[PDB]
């Protein structure tokens with residue numbers, strides 16, 4: 001199954017004392033007046049400047065950060081892919097599946113994340129003990145682990161680190177848009193292509209919603225903003241994020 005996710009007028013503080021004070025009241029919040037609704041099986045793309053609250057938003061959904069105002073609604077299990085890849089000492093297989101094995105699911109995830117060719121290189125195949133991996137292999141294994149988990153909501157925080165432009169595109173398509181096409185998911189990204197293929201987009205800046213709605217509505221309701229951001233996707237993660245950050249500081253509020 002999958003869930004809908006709804007946030008209505010949500011405000012949150014990481015400093016729990018302040019969150020209580022604000023709540024009771026009938027520094028500055030990490031997230032302010034956040035609103036979105038994603039339907040079952042839909043993709044929300046979340047972009048924004050550095051420190052804007054993109055990971056914090058995900059942490060709220062996981063219950064690590066509580067709102068001081070507003071309503072969050074969602075049900076079921078959550079799977080989370082962090083923006084920092086991590087590999088535990090053990091086999092490639094163990095890293096992806098943990099303890100529970102489903103052959104058909106495991107095979108579809110390795111294919112979707114392009115891990116077949118990485119696995120096949122080794123004598124032991126996926127029983128190879130984690131051999132040091134490249135950043136890109138680490139990113140793909142971390143993604144595979146998150147997508148393999150049977151969950152009702154998938155939270156993918158910038159999962160495409162150290163990938164080539166073309167293979168990030170291939171994996172966005174095969175994994176996020178095809179394998180997970182019927183799962184509710186939220187993707188943090190800085191690629192315009194990802195925003196374009198999303199059902200909904202949320203742009204965050206200093207904890208506020210700079211824009212929520214559709215890519216074509218962004219093109220329409222934010223023409224001056226779009227005109228800077230739209231060969232952007234060939235730029236490095238760092239450069240895209242610096243351009244997005246600087247543009248947001250210019251046009252915010």
Ligand SMILES: Nc1ncnc2c1ncn2[C@@H]1O[C@H](COP(=O)(O)OP(=O)(O)OP(=O)(O)O)[C@@H](O)[C@H]1O
Nearest residue numbers: 014015030048049050051052053054055056057083
């Ligand atoms: N557990 C926490 N406790 C206190 N403050 C936090 C915590 N997590 C994040 N913050 C702070 O909240 C702000 C938002 O950080 P967050 O990680 O949500 O930003 P981000 O938009 O994901 O940025 P990036 O583009 O760097 O990933 C930052 O000032 C950060 O230092």
Ligand SMILES: [Mg+2]
Nearest residue numbers: 054055056083
């Ligand atoms: Mg983050």
